[PDB]
Design a binder for this molecule. Structure first.
Ligand SMILES: Nc1ncnc2c1ncn2[C@@H]1O[C@H](CSCC[C@H](N)C(=O)O)[C@@H](O)[C@H]1O
Lengths: 18, 484
């Protein structure tokens, strides 16, 4: 398959206080 | 109007958006109050600090030339403004499935590493937030380069959208459609995070001497930050660093013009040639839009992080929270069985729309949740106990007919109870969509709340079919399948 699959718009955490 | 007035308003916004959570029953009220302060700031500012004279399609030729000069693929497709998805790529020749048709070398990317080596570097080296969260670092990298006329990435930035459909751009009444859903809490958090971050960084840029050289010091509007974080959240990707030992977040030009369809991930990073590579998800005839598969996300994540609602999303799901209660007289045994199965005592599981509705882990949890004392003992003691645990997630090997009847009864009842916590029914949502004329953003919100209930209703129906099936097996006293 893909060794480094790339996810467009991957969900990240934007909570700077968490 | 006055720089002192903006400073005072942002200080108030910072205090408001740094206060702790007010409790779920007051999050709507807090949301409106934060919106009120943000809209007062926004109406006293001039929108995007940097605007461009041409139309969006006027700059795609320079994007192609710039990408071509640096080794990207630029033949076989063209940019087209599609009504449904906005701008995307259209094939100008036939492209066969699995054909490598798109590649982007690392030099064109905007990354956390290129953010460090840019004018933002000095502030990055001191501020703890930028160091801990590469997505925010990417957003300011994007803003700084946008405000830099001689930036290497100007051909890319000038072709980005000027506006998005993330919930940061919704009207108050468009978000109000989401009241009583699971999704609305994340909408609240996104608005509160964004407003807090804008106010924090506004005050930092104005006073911290490490921001002295920043082009943002001349003008840094709320609209700037909303645009930058929406650009990053709808487009960023995870890639390996040049060495391959760590990962990083990146904006990938040209490739990020592809819109989404159902399928499999066909984009990977090639570390030996140091470039992103994308093979065709399916055959694309000349004149057909080129799509990719973004990833296995729910419609709540597509709306909130990706700025759109995707019909017939095969990976949609809703959350369901379940736990063994410490007041159960069988808590200790149930907790031990789950622990030996690698399952927590309390967790947030998912319910899916496609078949089956529940995963192997949720099935395993529900079986233990409903086990009698003698069934728990057989999963804890003797030479077959480990084998019994191993099949706990397997639909073909139930613990007992009565255990299945009980767990599907509970699930049917729980999903029906969740359905009753929504402010509207499925029939009402469908009537609104049919008999009201709505904006794209309002439709996103209504289809999102409808989609939550439709997953719950299908879980109800599948659980009732499972309950009746296993009840028949109990009546007939059929032999239990054994694994061998
Ligand atoms: N299947 C789809 N339906 C609707 N909008 C889509 C879509 N796939 C992608 N999009 C849109 O495209 C964005 C991802 S970036 C893709 C290029 C974008 N259309 C542009 O004009 O720059 C999403 O935020 C959403 O606005």
């Amino acid at each position: 398959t893909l060794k480094y699959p790339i996810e467009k718009g991957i969900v990240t955490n934007w909570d700077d206080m968490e | 109007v006055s720089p002192k007035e903006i400073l005072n308003l942002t200080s108030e916004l910072l205090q408001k958006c740094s206060s702790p959570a007010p409790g779920p029953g007051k999050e709507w009220e807090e949301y409106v109050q934060i919106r009120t302060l943000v809209e007062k700031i926004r109406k006293k500012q001039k929108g995007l600090s940097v605007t461009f004279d041409g139309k969006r399609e006027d700059y795609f030729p320079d994007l192609m030339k710039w990408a071509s000069e640096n080794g990207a693929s630029v033949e076989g497709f063209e940019m087209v403004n599609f009504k449904e998805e906005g701008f995307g790529l259209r094939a100008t020749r036939d492209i066969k499935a699995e054909e490598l048709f798109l590649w982007v070398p690392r030099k064109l990317l905007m990354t956390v590493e290129s953010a460090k080596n840019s004018v933002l570097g000095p502030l990055y080296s001191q501020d703890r937030i930028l160091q801990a969260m590469g997505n925010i670092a990417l957003a300011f990298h994007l803003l700084c380069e946008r405000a830099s006329p001689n930036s290497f990435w100007q051909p890319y930035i000038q072709t980005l959208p000027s506006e998005y459909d993330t919930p940061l751009y919704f009207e108050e009444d468009e978000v109000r459609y989401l009241q009583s859903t699971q999704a609305i809490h994340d909408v609240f958090s996104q608005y509160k995070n964004t407003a807090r971050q804008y106010a924090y960084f506004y005050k930092v840029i104005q006073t911290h001497p490490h921001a002295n050289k920043l082009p943002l010091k001349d003008s840094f509007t709320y609209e700037d930050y909303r645009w930058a974080v929406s650009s990053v959240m709808t487009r960023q990707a995870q890639i390996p660093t040049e060495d391959g030992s760590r990962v990083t977040l990146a904006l990938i030009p040209l490739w990020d013009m592809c819109n989404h369809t159902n399928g499999l991930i066909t984009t990977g990073y090639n570390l030996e040639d140091d470039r992103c590579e994308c093979v065709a998800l399916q055959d694309f005839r000349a004149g057909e839009q080129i799509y990719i598969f973004y990833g296995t996300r729910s419609n709540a994540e597509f709306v909130i992080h990706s700025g759109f609602f995707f019909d017939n999303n095969s990976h949609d799901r809703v959350k369901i929270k379940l736990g063994v209660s410490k007041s159960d007289r069988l808590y200790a045994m149930k907790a031990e069985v789950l622990a030996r199965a690698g399952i927590p005592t309390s967790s947030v599981f998912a319910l899916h729309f496609t078949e089956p509705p529940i995963s192997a882990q949720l099935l395993a949890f529900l079986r233990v949740f409903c086990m009698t004392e003698e069934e728990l003992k057989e999963h804890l003691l003797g030479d077959s106990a480990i084998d019994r645990i191993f099949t706990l997630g397997n639909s073909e090997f139930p613990v007992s007919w009565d255990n299945e009847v009980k767990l599907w009864t509970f699930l049917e009842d729980r999903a029906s109870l969740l359905l009753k916590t929504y402010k509207t029914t499925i029939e009402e949502d469908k009537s609104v969509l049919k008999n009201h004329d709505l904006s794209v953003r309002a439709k996103m919100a209504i289809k999102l709340r409808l989609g939550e209930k439709e997953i719950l209703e299908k879980a109800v129906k599948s659980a009732a079919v499972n309950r009746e099936y296993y009840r028949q097996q109990m009546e007939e006293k059929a032999p239990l399948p054994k694994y061998e």
